[PDB]
CSV table of C-alpha atoms and ligand atoms in Angstrom, one decimal:
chain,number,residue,atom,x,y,z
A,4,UNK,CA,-15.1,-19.8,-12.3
A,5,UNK,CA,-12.6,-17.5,-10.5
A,6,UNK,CA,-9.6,-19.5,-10.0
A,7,UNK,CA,-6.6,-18.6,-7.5
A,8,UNK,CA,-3.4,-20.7,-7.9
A,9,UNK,CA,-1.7,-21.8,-4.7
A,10,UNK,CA,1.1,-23.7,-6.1
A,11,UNK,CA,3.2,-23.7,-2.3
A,12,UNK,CA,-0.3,-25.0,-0.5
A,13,UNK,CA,-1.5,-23.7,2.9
A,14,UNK,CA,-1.3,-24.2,6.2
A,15,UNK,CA,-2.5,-23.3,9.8
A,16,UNK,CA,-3.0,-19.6,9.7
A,17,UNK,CA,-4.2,-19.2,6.0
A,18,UNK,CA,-7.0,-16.7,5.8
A,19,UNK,CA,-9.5,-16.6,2.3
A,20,UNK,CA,-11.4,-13.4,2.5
A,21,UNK,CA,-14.4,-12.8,0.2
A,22,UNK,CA,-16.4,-10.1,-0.4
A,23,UNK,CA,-19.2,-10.1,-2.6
A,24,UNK,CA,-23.5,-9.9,-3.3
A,25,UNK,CA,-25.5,-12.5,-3.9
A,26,UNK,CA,-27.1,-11.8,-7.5
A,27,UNK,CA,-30.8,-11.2,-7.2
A,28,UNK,CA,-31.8,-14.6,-8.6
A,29,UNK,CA,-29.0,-16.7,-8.0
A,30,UNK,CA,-29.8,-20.1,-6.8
A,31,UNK,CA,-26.2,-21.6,-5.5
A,32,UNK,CA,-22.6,-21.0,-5.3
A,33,UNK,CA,-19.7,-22.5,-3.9
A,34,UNK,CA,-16.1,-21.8,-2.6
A,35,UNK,CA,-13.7,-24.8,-2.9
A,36,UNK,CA,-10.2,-25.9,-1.6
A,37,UNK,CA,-9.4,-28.2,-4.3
A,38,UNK,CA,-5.9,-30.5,-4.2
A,39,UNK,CA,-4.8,-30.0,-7.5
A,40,UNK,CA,-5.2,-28.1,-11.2
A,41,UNK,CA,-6.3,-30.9,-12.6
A,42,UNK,CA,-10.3,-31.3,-13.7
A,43,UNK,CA,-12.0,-33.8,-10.9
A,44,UNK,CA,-9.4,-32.9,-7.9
A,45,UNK,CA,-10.0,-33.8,-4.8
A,46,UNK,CA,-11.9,-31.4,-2.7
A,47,UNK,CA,-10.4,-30.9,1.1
A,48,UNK,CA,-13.1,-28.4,1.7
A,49,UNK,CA,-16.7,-27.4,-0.5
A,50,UNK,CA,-18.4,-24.5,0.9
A,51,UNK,CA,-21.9,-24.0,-0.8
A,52,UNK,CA,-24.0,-21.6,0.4
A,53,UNK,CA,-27.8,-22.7,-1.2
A,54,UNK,CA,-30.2,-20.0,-1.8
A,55,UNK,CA,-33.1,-22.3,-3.4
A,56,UNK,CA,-32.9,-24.5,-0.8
A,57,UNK,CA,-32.4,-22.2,1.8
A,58,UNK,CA,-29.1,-23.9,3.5
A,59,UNK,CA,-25.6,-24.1,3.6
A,60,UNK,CA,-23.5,-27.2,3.3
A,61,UNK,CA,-20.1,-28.2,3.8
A,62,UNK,CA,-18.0,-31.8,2.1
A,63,UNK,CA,-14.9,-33.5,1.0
A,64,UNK,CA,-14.8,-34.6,-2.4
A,65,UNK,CA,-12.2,-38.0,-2.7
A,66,UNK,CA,-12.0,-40.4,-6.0
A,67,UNK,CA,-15.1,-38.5,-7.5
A,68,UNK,CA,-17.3,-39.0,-4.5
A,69,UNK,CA,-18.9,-37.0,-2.2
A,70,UNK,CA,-18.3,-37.1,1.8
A,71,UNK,CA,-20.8,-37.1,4.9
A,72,UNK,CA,-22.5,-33.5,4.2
A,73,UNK,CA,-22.5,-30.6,7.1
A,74,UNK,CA,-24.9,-28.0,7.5
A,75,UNK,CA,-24.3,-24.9,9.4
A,76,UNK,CA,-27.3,-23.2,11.0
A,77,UNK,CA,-29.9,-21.6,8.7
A,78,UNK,CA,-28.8,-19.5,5.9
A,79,UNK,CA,-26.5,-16.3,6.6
A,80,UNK,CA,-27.1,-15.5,3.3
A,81,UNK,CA,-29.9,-13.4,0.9
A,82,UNK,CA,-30.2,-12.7,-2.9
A,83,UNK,CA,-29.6,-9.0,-3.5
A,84,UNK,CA,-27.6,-8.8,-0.4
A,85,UNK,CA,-24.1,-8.5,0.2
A,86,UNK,CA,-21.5,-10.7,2.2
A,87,UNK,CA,-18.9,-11.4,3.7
A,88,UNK,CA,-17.0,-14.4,4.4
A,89,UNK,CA,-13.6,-15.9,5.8
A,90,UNK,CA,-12.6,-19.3,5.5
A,91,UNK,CA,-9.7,-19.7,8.0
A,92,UNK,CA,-7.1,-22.8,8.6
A,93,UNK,CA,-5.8,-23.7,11.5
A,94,UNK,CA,-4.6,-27.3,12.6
A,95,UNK,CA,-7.7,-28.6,13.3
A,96,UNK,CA,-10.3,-27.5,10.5
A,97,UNK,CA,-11.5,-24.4,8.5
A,98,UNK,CA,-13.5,-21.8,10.2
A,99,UNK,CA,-16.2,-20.5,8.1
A,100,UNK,CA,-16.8,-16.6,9.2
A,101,UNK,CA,-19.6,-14.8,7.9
A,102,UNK,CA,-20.8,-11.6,8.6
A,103,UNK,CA,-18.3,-11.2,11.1
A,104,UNK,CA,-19.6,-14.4,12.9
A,105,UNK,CA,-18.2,-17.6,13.3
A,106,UNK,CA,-20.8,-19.9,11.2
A,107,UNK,CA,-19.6,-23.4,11.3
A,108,UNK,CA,-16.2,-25.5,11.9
A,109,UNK,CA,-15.0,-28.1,9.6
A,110,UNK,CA,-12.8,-30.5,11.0
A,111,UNK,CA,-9.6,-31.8,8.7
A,112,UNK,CA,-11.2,-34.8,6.5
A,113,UNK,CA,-8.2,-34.5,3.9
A,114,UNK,CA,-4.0,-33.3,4.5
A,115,UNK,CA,-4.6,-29.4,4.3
A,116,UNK,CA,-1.1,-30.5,3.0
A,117,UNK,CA,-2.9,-31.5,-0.1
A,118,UNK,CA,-4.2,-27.6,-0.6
A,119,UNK,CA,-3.0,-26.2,-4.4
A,120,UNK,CA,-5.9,-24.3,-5.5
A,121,UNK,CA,-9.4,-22.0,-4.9
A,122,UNK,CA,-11.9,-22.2,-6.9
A,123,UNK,CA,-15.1,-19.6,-6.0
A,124,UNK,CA,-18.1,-21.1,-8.7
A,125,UNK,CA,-21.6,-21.0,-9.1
A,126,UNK,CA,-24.0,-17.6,-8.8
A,127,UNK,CA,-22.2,-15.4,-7.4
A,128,UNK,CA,-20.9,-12.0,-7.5
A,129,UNK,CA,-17.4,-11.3,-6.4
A,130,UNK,CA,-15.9,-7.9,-5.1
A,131,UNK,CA,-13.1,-9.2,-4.3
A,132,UNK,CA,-10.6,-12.8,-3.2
A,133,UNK,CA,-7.4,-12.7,-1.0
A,134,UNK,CA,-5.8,-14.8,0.2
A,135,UNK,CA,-2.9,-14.0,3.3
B,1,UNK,CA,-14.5,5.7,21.8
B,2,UNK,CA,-14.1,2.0,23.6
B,3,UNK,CA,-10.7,2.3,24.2
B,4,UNK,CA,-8.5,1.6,26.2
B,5,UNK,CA,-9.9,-1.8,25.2
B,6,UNK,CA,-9.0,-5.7,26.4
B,7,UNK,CA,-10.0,-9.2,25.0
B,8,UNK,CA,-9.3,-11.6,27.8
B,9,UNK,CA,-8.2,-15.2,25.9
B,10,UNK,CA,-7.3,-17.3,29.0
B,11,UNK,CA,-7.1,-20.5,27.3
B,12,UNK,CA,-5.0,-18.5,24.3
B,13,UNK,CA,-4.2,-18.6,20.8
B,14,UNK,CA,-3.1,-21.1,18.4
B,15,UNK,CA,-2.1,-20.8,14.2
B,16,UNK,CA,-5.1,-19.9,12.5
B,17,UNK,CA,-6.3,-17.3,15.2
B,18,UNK,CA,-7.6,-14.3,13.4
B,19,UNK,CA,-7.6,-10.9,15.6
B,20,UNK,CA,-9.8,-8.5,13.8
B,21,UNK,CA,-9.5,-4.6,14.6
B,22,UNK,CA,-11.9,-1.9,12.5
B,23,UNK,CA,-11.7,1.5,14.1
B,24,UNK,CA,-11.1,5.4,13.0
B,25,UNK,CA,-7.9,7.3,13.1
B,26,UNK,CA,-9.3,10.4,14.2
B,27,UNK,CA,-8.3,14.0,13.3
B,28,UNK,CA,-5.5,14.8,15.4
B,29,UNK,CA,-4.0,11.4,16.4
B,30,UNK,CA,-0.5,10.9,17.3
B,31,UNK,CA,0.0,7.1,17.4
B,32,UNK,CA,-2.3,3.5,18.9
B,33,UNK,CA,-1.3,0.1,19.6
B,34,UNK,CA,-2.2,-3.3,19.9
B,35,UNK,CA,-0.9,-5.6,22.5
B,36,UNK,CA,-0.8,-9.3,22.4
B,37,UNK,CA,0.0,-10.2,25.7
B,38,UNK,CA,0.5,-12.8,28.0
B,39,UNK,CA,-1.2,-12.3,31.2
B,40,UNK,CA,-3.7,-9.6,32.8
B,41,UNK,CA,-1.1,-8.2,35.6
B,42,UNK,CA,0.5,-4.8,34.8
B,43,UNK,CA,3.7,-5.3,33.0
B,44,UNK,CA,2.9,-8.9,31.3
B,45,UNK,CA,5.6,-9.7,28.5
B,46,UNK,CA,4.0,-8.6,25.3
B,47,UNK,CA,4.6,-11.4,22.3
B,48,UNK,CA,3.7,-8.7,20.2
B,49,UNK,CA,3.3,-4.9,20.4
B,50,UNK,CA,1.8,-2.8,16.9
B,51,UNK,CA,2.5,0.6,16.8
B,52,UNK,CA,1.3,2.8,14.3
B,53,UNK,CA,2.7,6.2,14.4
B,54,UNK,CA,1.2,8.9,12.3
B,55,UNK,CA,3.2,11.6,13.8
B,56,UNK,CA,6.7,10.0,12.8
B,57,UNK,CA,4.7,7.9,9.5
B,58,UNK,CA,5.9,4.4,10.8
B,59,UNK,CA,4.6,1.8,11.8
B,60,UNK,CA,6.7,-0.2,14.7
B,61,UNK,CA,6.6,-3.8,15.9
B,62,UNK,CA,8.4,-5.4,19.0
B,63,UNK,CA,8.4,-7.9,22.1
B,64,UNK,CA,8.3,-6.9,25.7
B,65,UNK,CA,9.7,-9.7,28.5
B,66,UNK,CA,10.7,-9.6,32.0
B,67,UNK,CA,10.0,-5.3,31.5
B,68,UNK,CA,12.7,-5.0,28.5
B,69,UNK,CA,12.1,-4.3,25.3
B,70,UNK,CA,13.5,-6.3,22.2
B,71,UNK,CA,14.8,-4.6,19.1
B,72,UNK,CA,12.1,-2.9,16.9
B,73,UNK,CA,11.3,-3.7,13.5
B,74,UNK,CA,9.3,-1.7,10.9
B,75,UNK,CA,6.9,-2.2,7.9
B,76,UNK,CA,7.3,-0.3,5.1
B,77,UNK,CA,5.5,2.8,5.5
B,78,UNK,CA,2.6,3.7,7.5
B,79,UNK,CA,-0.9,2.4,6.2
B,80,UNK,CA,-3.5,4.7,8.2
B,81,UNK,CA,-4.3,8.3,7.8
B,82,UNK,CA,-5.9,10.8,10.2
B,83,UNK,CA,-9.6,11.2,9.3
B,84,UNK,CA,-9.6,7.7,7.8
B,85,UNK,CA,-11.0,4.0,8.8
B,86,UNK,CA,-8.9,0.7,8.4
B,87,UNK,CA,-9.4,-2.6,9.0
B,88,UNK,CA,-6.6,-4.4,10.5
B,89,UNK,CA,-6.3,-8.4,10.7
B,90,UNK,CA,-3.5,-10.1,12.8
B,91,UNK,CA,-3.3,-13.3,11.7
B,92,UNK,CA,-1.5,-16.0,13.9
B,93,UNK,CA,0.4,-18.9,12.3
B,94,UNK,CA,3.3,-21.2,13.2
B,95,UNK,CA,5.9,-18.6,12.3
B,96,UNK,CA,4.5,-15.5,13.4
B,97,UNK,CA,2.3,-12.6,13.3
B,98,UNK,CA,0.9,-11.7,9.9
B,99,UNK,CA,-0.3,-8.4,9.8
B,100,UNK,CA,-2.9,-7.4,7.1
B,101,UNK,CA,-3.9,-3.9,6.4
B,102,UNK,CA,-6.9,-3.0,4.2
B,103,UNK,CA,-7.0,-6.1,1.9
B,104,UNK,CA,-3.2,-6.3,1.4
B,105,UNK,CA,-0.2,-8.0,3.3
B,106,UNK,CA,1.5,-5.6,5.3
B,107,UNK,CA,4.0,-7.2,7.3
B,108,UNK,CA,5.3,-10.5,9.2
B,109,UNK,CA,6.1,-10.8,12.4
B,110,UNK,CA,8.1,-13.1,13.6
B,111,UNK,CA,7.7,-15.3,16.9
B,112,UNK,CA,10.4,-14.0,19.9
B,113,UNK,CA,7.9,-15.2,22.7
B,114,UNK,CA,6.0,-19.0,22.3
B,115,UNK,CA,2.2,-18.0,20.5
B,116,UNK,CA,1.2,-20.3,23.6
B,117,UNK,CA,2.0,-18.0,26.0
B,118,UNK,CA,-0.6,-15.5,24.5
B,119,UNK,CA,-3.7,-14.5,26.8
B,120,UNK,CA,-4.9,-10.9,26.6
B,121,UNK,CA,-5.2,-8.4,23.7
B,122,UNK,CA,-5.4,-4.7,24.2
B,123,UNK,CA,-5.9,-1.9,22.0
B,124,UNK,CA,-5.4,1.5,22.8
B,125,UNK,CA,-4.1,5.1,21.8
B,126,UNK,CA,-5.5,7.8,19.5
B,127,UNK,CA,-8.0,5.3,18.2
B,128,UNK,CA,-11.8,5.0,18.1
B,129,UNK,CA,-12.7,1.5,17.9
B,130,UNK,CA,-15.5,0.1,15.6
B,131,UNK,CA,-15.2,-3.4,16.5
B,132,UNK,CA,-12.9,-6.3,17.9
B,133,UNK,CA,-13.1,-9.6,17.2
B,134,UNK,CA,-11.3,-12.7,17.2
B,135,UNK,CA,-11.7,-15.8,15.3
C,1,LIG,O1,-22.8,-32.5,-1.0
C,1,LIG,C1,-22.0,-31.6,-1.9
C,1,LIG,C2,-22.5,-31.8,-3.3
C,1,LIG,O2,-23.9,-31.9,-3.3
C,1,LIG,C3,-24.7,-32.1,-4.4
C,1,LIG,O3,-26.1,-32.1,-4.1
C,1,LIG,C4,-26.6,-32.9,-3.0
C,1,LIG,C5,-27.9,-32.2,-2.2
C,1,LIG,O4,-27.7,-32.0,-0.8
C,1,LIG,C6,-29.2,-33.0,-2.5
C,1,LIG,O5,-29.7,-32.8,-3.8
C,1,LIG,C7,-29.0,-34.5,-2.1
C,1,LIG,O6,-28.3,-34.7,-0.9
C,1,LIG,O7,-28.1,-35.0,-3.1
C,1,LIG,C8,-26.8,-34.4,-3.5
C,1,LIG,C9,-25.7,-35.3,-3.0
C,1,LIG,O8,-25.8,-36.6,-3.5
C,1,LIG,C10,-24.4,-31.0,-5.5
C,1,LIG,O9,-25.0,-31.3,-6.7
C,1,LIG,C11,-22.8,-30.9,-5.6
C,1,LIG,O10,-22.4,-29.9,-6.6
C,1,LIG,C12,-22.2,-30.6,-4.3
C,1,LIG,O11,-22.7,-29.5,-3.7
């Protein structure tokens, strides 16, 4: 689970680039904005593409329990096939770009205050994680 | 080439705007630019003007209002090559102008003139575009 330590948070004008391949037979992965180090933080933002099921859905994750599910449009996604995704803050929510598309907006549910850490987990392959 | 190139944003930019620039510096190029500025007349203030020069090897930033120019600043080094693509993002916060060269941090750029004011982008120079995109 490839972790990346943002001890000083985020705010509007955060960009996390991706760039990977989805492994052949993978089934799911997942990128998440998670509001502390700590095992069962809260989750401002989960990102989790779905191969299996063919769809991509966004939550929150508070106290242990998951939000209201989102679900952008179809799947901009394919095993064996390469990607690329930004998940961009701004005031209002994230912006989830993918293949140089704007995919699906997900409006504040938690402080983006709250930010301290990314986690990218599931089946995944990963070329590489900034963050700027 | 699809230069000289313009990206009308009449209701503007706010933090978290992502401008995305791929292109080629081709063979013989002097120098390009990319404008943020704040209206479509000739002469609009420019909130931000990025200059990459591969003659001199620097890259400069400034402002432009009411026709004068502020005082330059520059990042360290230049980060394009003649006969070589790049992909630039300038990435818009409450501070400034972050300006990210091929997957690393390149330099921030302060605000002079209010991000609000912001409605046009232009690209131009010795540049052949690939793509522009803003997010
Ligand atoms: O919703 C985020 C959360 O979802 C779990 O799976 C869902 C799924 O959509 C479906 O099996 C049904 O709605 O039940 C579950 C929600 O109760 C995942 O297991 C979990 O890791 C997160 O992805």
């Amino acid at each position: 689970p490839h972790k990346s330590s943002l001890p000083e948070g985020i705010a509007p004008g955060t960009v996390l680039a991706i760039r990977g391949l989805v492994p052949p037979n993978a089934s799911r992965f997942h990128v998440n904005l998670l509001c502390g180090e700590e095992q069962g933080s809260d989750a401002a933002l989960h990102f989790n593409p779905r191969l299996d099921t063919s769809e991509v859905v966004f939550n929150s994750k508070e106290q242990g329990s998951w939000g209201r599910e989102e679900r952008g449009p179809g799947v901009p996604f394919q095993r064996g096939q390469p990607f690329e995704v930004l998940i961009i803050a701004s005031d209002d929510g994230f912006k989830a770009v993918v293949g140089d598309a704007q995919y699906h907006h997900f409006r504040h549910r938690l402080p983006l205050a709250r930010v301290r850490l990314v986690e990218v987990g599931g089946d995944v392959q990963l070329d590489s994680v900034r963050i700027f």
